[PDB]
Specification:
It is classed as transferase. The chain is α+β, with helices and mostly antiparallel strands and 327 residues long. The chain is built from 11 helices and 9 strands. Strands 1-2-3-5-4 form a 5-stranded antiparallel beta sheet. It has a two-stranded antiparallel ribbon with strand order 6-9. It has a two-stranded antiparallel ribbon with strand order 7-8. Guanosine-5'-diphosphate binds next to helix 3 and helix 4.
Length: 327
């Protein structure tokens, strides 16, 4: 059987809290008035929700309305509890109201306005200074939710909203977010393909906050090397092969050895044998101005197979890469 694993930080935050904090099923939703919000335009549709630009007609302030699809409606209380627990946190989206949509008859989450601009729209355009600045702002959010005993589990460019003109950032879509309980086995079908950690890809269920640090590392690698996405798998199996072509197969076998994981035998015909690549392999004339010894050292410490060997959000914020950022 697999060897158990525990978070090296904020391990017991929820164990010490009263049940009310993490027992989301016991939470009683104070339903608002759906009439207060007039939908303006559909911003997008995912497999679990529909997002709209809206106006709170009473105060004329712009808001964002997220309407849950029937498939996601069942986990409404988890997302509400997390959003309320984190409200006021640095760079975390602010929940303004919870209403029952009259058409879908599913819950609708109302958020204070943030720019329609995803980080995906800008992150391949940033200077060396701005990559550092924005990565620090993201770290602020991650360290805060981790310190509050929450894992985001869907860190990706589409889940970061940016107001570049006003140097403002918000970490959004807390729909897959979960409370960390030590020893708990979680669902590996979380995060988007390109941002999935090796723990997910090898089916190791006893993961923690460090999952978010891998996802952040993928985002950094894509920004500094101008390669969208950095690990470009055709499916979840090929995703592990793409990572192994960079990090090597020897450290992957060491990782699975350490946690006594049994790799899906389909990997025997595609994984092959690969040496760890030096990061300078990914440097070229177009991205060299974004690459520094500090950036590469920082990336090296995020993109590790062993989820326990990855920098934590706080340790990441202490990194020399962030010394040039005004604090
Ligand atoms: N509240 C909410 N739930 C979501 C959202 N996206 C996904 N979900 C739900 O999250 C579930 C997956 O989370 P998970 O922890 O794996 O739950 P499990 O299937 O019960 O193990 C999906 O089945 C959806 O119901 C979202 O945006 N909001």
């Amino acid at each position: 059987g697999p060897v158990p694993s525990r978070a090296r930080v904020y391990t017991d935050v929820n164990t010490h809290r009263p049940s009310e904090y993490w027992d989301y099923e016991s939470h009683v939703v104070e339903w608002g008035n759906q009439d207060d919000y007039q939908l303006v335009r559909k911003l997008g549709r995912g497999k679990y929700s529909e997002v709209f630009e809206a106006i709170n007609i009473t105060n004329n302030e712009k808001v964002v309305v997220k309407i849950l699809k029937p498939v996601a409606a069942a986990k409404i209380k988890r997302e509400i509890k997390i959003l309320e627990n984190l409200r006021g946190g640095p760079n975390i989206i602010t929940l303004a109201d919870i209403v029952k949509d009259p058409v879908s008859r599913t819950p609708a989450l109302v958020f204070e306005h943030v720019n329609n601009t995803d980080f995906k729209q800008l992150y391949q355009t940033l200077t060396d200074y701005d990559i550092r600045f924005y990565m620090y702002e993201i770290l602020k959010a991650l360290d805060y939710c981790h310190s509050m005993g929450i894992m985001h589990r869907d860190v990706k460019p589409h889940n970061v909203m940016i107001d570049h003109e006003h140097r403002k950032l918000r970490l959004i879509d807390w729909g897959l977010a979960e409370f960390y309980h030590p020893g708990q086995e979680y669902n590996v079908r979380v995060a988007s393909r390109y941002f999935k950690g090796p723990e997910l890809l090898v089916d190791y269920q006893m993961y923690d906050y460090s999952l978010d640090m891998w996802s952040l590392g993928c985002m950094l690698a894509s920004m500094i090397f101008r390669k969208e996405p950095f690990f470009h798998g055709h499916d979840n199996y090929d995703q592990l092969v793409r990572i192994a072509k960079v990090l090597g197969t020897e450290d992957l076998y060491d990782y699975i050895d350490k946690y006594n994981i049994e790799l899906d035998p389909r990997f025997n015909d595609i994984l092959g044998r690969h040496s760890r690549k030096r990061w300078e392999r990914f440097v070229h004339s177009e991205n060299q101005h974004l690459v520094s010894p500090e950036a590469l050292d920082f990336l090296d410490k995020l993109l590790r197979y062993d989820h326990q060997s990855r920098l934590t959000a706080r340790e990441a914020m202490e990194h020399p890469y962030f010394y040039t950022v005004v604090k």
